[PDB]
Design an enzyme around this catalytic site. Structure first.
Site, PDB file in Angstrom:
ATOM      1  N   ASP A   1     -19.185  12.459  -9.303  1.00 30.71           N
ATOM      2  CA  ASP A   1     -18.540  11.093  -8.851  1.00 30.71           C
ATOM      3  C   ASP A   1     -18.457  10.229  -8.929  1.00 30.71           C
ATOM      4  OD1 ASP A   1     -16.433  11.308  -6.890  1.00 30.71           O
ATOM      5  OD2 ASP A   1     -17.625  12.169  -5.133  1.00 30.71           O
TER       6      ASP A   1
ATOM      7  N   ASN B   1     -11.070  15.388  -2.262  1.00 29.79           N
ATOM      8  CA  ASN B   1     -12.066  15.216  -2.746  1.00 29.79           C
ATOM      9  C   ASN B   1     -12.718  15.961  -1.560  1.00 29.79           C
ATOM     10  OD1 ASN B   1     -11.643  14.562  -4.968  1.00 29.79           O
ATOM     11  ND2 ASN B   1     -13.439  12.404  -4.989  1.00 29.79           N
ATOM     12  N   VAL B   2     -13.770  16.388  -1.250  1.00 30.41           N
ATOM     13  CA  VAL B   2     -14.340  17.159   0.077  1.00 30.41           C
ATOM     14  C   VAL B   2     -15.866  17.128   0.475  1.00 30.41           C
ATOM     15  CG1 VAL B   2     -14.188  18.987   1.886  1.00 30.41           C
ATOM     16  CG2 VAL B   2     -12.673  18.320   0.244  1.00 30.41           C
ATOM     17  N   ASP B   3     -16.336  16.992   0.936  1.00 32.69           N
ATOM     18  CA  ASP B   3     -17.700  16.677   0.767  1.00 32.69           C
ATOM     19  C   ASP B   3     -18.132  16.552   2.477  1.00 32.69           C
ATOM     20  OD1 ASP B   3     -20.550  16.139   0.354  1.00 32.69           O
ATOM     21  OD2 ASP B   3     -19.850  13.868   0.277  1.00 32.69           O
ATOM     22  N   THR B   4     -18.414  15.642   2.989  1.00 34.55           N
ATOM     23  CA  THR B   4     -18.698  15.659   4.666  1.00 34.55           C
ATOM     24  C   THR B   4     -18.572  16.754   4.949  1.00 34.55           C
ATOM     25  OG1 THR B   4     -17.767  12.868   4.044  1.00 34.55           O
ATOM     26  CG2 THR B   4     -19.418  13.898   6.055  1.00 34.55           C
TER      27      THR B   4
ATOM     28  N   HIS C   1     -14.415   7.435   2.679  1.00 40.36           N
ATOM     29  CA  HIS C   1     -15.376   8.310   3.069  1.00 40.36           C
ATOM     30  C   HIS C   1     -16.204   8.480   4.784  1.00 40.36           C
ATOM     31  CE1 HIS C   1     -14.794   6.882  -1.359  1.00 40.36           C
ATOM     32  NE2 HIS C   1     -14.698   7.913  -1.456  1.00 40.36           N
ATOM     33  N   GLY C   2     -16.458  10.150   4.033  1.00 43.53           N
ATOM     34  CA  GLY C   2     -17.200  10.179   5.662  1.00 43.53           C
ATOM     35  C   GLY C   2     -16.670  10.865   6.684  1.00 43.53           C
TER      36      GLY C   2
HETATM   37 NA    NA Z   1     -13.839  11.190   5.193  1.00 43.77          NA
HETATM   38 ZN   LIG Z   2     -14.253   8.202  -3.150  1.00 39.58          ZN
HETATM   39 ZN   LIG Z   3     -14.024   6.715  -3.674  1.00 40.82          ZN
END
Ligand code: NA
Ligand SMILES: [Zn+2]
Ligand SMILES: [Zn+2]
Ligand code: NA
Ligand code: NA
Ligand code: NA
Ligand SMILES: [Zn+2]
Ligand SMILES: [Zn+2]
Ligand SMILES: [Zn+2]
Ligand SMILES: [Zn+2]
Ligand SMILES: [Zn+2]
Ligand SMILES: [Zn+2]
Lengths: 279, 279, 277, 277
Positions: free
Chosen positions: C82, C220-223, C170-171
């Protein structure tokens, strides 16, 4: 595994007036003949996985087979893809962890050869592996490359070492070859890159030594090794046709091929040069 | 990799009145001949890494070479250590991930053979790999095992399959063998374990079929394959001594050996039995 | 190991109106949370190795750690690089045997983004791995891509799936986002490739569902996973600060993160879809 | 990978009056803490994979995770199976390529402990890996082994290094321990093999030093490292409960654990000893 970038080996050879032998592999015994020869001579070596062995054994299996036989080897070894005419196959070798690739676009148009070779070179440079390209056709024993074509090709592709057509051919020579020494000398001063000699089998020793002084830093040898192997096998089987111990029949082939590889290593001036890559 | 415990293969063979062929490997082409034969016949197979190939190529390199050639193979395959006379070497095969080992203590005293074979068996059982032992010497073509010795040995060692001396020998037979069929029948009822036939090369087909009915569930074949290989190579080189393409000379050896392996697979009744191990 | 090309996964999702969850990994417990969630839900998943974990653990070590934990996994798994901004790093992932890569050229000029993204795509296509690119910047929570720019970018680069600026970031979201649904629909009909949604953590579920029906096929999943993990750990250590059994403290993080991944798998409509592969 | 037999390491320690630290691993960050400590101190180390981590992460996955993190490590490393009570599990570690195994038969009868420990030792000797056994039970912090029993056990089993009951226990010490120094000295002269100290967490430094001079050449440390890790994590999450960057929270755990491992390496006299191998 003592594996080293083909660029590292070839630049050192070129800078020190010797050549790396690029010995084509076909099976277990041929791998061992080459590795044992290099280890005995304390020589850096290239093992070439080419089109014929890929068709018989497979690219990844041959890579894995080399890995398997590296257990007792301490000299620099570079696994090199030879004669690739496919971007896909070249990328497979990169993914399999080869230390050098040749994209042979010599049958394409100049622009197409440049385009694909450059793409391969950018991948190789990114991953610290050597890249070879070819400008000018080299056929079989059955068109000398111009300085202009070689310079343009070299500059547009950023290849590390360059194969050119300079009087050699693949296979057993019918007529003794005569290398284009004047052309090599011009290329040394204009192209200023290490040159690869295809068709090294059966070239007179004196002409090899001369070519190396003019900037040949990789010499490809395949047929002469397979001849040596076949001679050893033939000797056993002609004398004792019911000798079924492969360790004897194929092992004699291995021994005779190992002697031939030792002969080439020394011809190329690569014996003892392993020390230069430790530090 | 479709690798399966030798115990799983042999018990199934024994319970269904067929035998697993245990084909000795020597190099790349011999591995391929066996695997291609098994894949074509949809047959479970054992590939034997024995003492001679260990001395030439090395135990771990031969294991790794099999792994390399398993990419397109879907049938059950068991890598088996043959003729080990060393606890150390047997443990090396275990660590290298073999699916079967033979500790051959047949040259030791009964008690010493029992002691070491049992130690190997306990390791094998722990790791779900097959274990073979031998009671009674089997020599070269250049002492039939008693039921009592076989039963005691089997019970004290807990071996999965048992090699016994029953009229075979290793190598090309001078005189045609005659198997101890009465002795095999007794062992089936007393020992009640699958029997391994060493020296399977050159045993008449009719006697093999009969032996399998009496509880032979593993048949070792080495010499007959190396003969087939050597015949193929010899044919090419006698006809065309300057044929240096190994893909032709050694590939003909591979082809003739592959036909021989196919012949044995069918003799043993193992063709089509791959389906039994999927589920 | 049940590894599958990113292109194979995303195409199937896009063709069938669902999305593959692309869950960012950081260590052993996070890898296990994701794999155990996918195995339970019989769902194809992407595990994303991104820039932060590369800086901490290394690219190749993270790949090898995933491999180590695949022993009991039967569902399709794709390891995805990523947010790469380096051709060299992208080639490293190719050599390490990833099943998908993102070259994020969105901070470059259009021409230079096209040039490098196309080079990456050519390599990916050769080796049967998925390739993602990005046109239009996606920032942090603390500007919509045009259909024409997305079409030109897509056709020149030959990417398999495309990240675009569509109202996410993001975040942790400060304000509630509102996705550009009509723009997504236009892209579906004109660009005719699966769209990747960056900034999937914290987007309202109904807007995710709607986006997926309009051709978002990778989320997309992270936080949100790291939050779930951190909540589980925090819970144990606040209650029992002398709890030194990592299997308890970090295992609770693993459990709470696993539940979150299960929640996302279902949101995306990917549960049960392992059967299709 | 710079892997070395446990026997080679422990013998050298014993011969030179120092000990190898045997540090228990639990996940990626704990592995890295230990390896980074060893690399900094140029110290040989053992990484112990024990029963709890096997239950959580798996034996072979933990081995493979160590392998993944050895890329930049140049010091001698030995992967050690701790507290195995199963011949089968001990053989699994052998097959997975461990450099040392402990068969802990201390809950069996003397004869049965000898029988299984000897079988494990024969395998270890064949493959050039270290083998540890135990005579006399070592419990939890919430009974001294005789010299004669230790000699008989040692000679029958052929273990390379021996765990004995000498005044230690596993876990947080309630009361301050007092080691049986005179017994250690007798064992040094009569058994003539390196002794392993179980329960090394929380033992006074001066008693550790003294024990090492009397032939303790492997010191097991687990709890004290997990405490150090947990302290670092706790610190971050108590101060910033919405810190969701695992590189910060778990990375601080890693840092505090790394300092603890450095402290133990020096205590054991193993710093700089990488040069000897
Ligand atoms: Na987000
Ligand atoms: Zn991204
Ligand atoms: Zn991005
Ligand atoms: Na030639
Ligand atoms: Na025979
Ligand atoms: Na303790
Ligand atoms: Zn050529
Ligand atoms: Zn050529
Ligand atoms: Zn025999
Ligand atoms: Zn035999
Ligand atoms: Zn203990
Ligand atoms: Zn203990």
């Amino acid at each position: 595994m003592s594996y080293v970038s083909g660029n590292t080996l070839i630049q050192h050879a070129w800078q020190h007036g010797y050549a790396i032998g690029a010995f084509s592999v076909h099976n277990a015994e041929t791998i061992r003949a080459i590795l044992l020869a290099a280890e005995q001579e304390q020589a850096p070596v290239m093992l070439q996985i080419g089109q014929k062995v890929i068709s018989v054994m497979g690219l990844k299996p041959m890579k894995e087979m080399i890995d398997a036989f590296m257990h007792d080897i301490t000299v620099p070894v570079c696994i090199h893809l030879d004669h690739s005419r496919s971007f896909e196959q070249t990328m497979e070798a990169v993914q399999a962890g080869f230390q050098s690739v040749m994209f042979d676009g010599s049958h394409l148009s100049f622009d197409e050869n440049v385009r694909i070779t450059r793409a391969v070179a950018d991948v190789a440079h990114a991953l610290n592996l050597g890249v070879e390209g070819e400008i000018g056709k080299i056929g079989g024993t059955e068109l000398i490359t111009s300085c202009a074509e070689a310079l343009k090709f070299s500059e547009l592709t950023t290849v590390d070492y360059l194969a050119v057509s300079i009087g050699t051919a693949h296979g057993m020579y019918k007529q003794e070859p005569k290398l284009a020494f004047e052309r090599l000398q011009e290329m040394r001063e204009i192209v200023k890159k290490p040159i690869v000699l295809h068709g090294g089998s059966g070239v007179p020793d004196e002409q090899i030594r001369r070519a190396i002084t003019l900037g040949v830093a990789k010499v490809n040898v395949d047929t002469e090794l397979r001849q040596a192997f076949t001679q050893g096998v033939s000797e056993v089987l002609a004398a004792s046709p019911d000798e079924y111990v492969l360790a004897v029949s194929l092992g004699r082939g291995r021994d005779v091929m190992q002697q031939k590889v030792i002969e080439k290593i020394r011809l190329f001036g690569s014996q003892g040069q392993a020390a230069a890559f430790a530090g």
